[PDB]
Amino acid sequence: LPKSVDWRKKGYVTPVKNQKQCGSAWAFSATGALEGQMFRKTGKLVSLSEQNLVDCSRPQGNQGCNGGFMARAFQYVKENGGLDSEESYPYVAVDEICKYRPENSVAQDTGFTVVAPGKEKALMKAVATVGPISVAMDAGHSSFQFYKSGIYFEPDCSSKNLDHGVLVVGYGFEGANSQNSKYWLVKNSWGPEWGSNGYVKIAKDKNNHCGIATAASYPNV
Ligand SMILES: [Cl-]
Ligand SMILES: [Cl-]
Ligand SMILES: [Cl-]
Ligand SMILES: [Cl-]
Ligand code: NA
């Protein structure tokens, strides 16, 4: 596999978004993975609608602003036949009436692929060969809230009890040796002001730190 990957440098990733006071990170993680796969298929980068997922995917087991899961969002897009653009179905950060319009759909998927749980090497292969990957993580720490630079490593992090969905856009390493001081490049949904332009470097191959490889998946387009 490549020594490093960064799908932002290839046009696969939209500018950083902000979920605000709504527990919809699972929806931003799912739209980020679908934006990359639609870009790989068509060559067009189009921002997708988190609000469409928040308002319409309760039957699949999501709970809008009270939480949800990326696989359930990809299941909804498959059963639904489509997903509207961010432009046509804007984000308001509260649970609202489902206003899905097929004529405004700009994306589709046939289901999703799961990365084997807990396998950082399996996540590395998916990121190198597919594009950005949806992942769950333990983000419940002040050290994450105030992250700004460096490789994030928190002793209090759990690899099994997770509470936040994010998007792995690549991986890399510090220095000249590609085999040490490794990190995952992660896009968050707390706005560009959070973290480093809305991103964080999370320690890689340090025993599945913060659970990044515990529940990873991507849509099949
Ligand atoms: Cl459940
Ligand atoms: Cl999931
Ligand atoms: Cl840094
Ligand atoms: Cl940057
Ligand atoms: Na920084």
Side-chain angles (χ1 to χ4, degrees):
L1 300 170
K3 291 173 163 167
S4 66
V5 173
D6 187 352
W7 292 106
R8 299 173 297 173
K9 286 181 170 191
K10 292 172 56 78
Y12 281 60
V13 187
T14 59
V16 173
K17 308 183 185 178
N18 197 334
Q19 68 186 89
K20 304 287 179 60
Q21 302 305 127
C22 166
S24 52
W26 56 274
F28 287 86
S29 174
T31 56
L34 197 56
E35 286 157 357
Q37 292 310 288
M38 291 304 305
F39 181 81
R40 164 163 287 217
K41 183 181 184 91
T42 73
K44 309 273 136 177
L45 185 69
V46 180
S47 187
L48 302 173
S49 178
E50 294 79 23
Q51 195 67 51
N52 184 166
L53 293 178
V54 164
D55 301 344
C56 309
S57 67
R58 284 182 182 266
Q60 291 78 25
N62 291 327
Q63 287 184 38
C65 287
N66 188 50
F69 296 97
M70 294 80 75
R72 296 180 180 171
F74 303 137
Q75 179 194 337
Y76 162 82
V77 171
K78 175 193 84 165
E79 301 183 352
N80 191 56
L83 184 69
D84 289 338
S85 65
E86 178 86 70
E87 210 102 77
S88 73
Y89 199 149
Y91 186 68
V92 293
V94 296
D95 300 285
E96 296 204 329
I97 297 291
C98 179
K99 297 178 283 293
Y100 174 69
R101 297 169 68 173
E103 72 276 16
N104 290 156
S105 180
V106 293
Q108 292 185 123
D109 69 48
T110 67
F112 60 89
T113 296
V114 173
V115 176
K119 299 184 182 193
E120 280 189 278
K121 191 173 168 189
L123 174 61
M124 188 183 166
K125 182 172 176 184
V127 173
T129 70
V130 171
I133 306 301
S134 293
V135 309
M137 74 171 287
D138 175 11
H141 297 101
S142 311
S143 57
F144 194 66
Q145 179 184 357
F146 292 106
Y147 170 84
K148 198 49 67 176
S149 301
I151 299 178
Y152 182 72
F153 187 86
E154 171 54 68
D156 301 335
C157 243
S158 181
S159 298
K160 68 203 202 196
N161 290 136
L162 319 180
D163 62 3
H164 187 55
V166 295
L167 184 74
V168 174
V169 301
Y171 58 82
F173 58 90
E174 306 287 9
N177 191 331
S178 70
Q179 300 304 303
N180 71 351
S181 50
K182 302 187 274 190
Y183 55 81
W184 296 106
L185 289 168
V186 172
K187 189 191 196 192
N188 202 354
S189 53
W190 289 352
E193 308 95 338
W194 174 80
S196 212
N197 310 308
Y199 290 88
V200 56
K201 290 187 173 116
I202 295 179
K204 174 169 174 284
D205 298 324
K206 290 297 177 191
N207 291 323
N208 191 20
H209 198 55
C210 300
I212 70 291
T214 296
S217 66
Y218 61 88
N220 295 141
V221 302

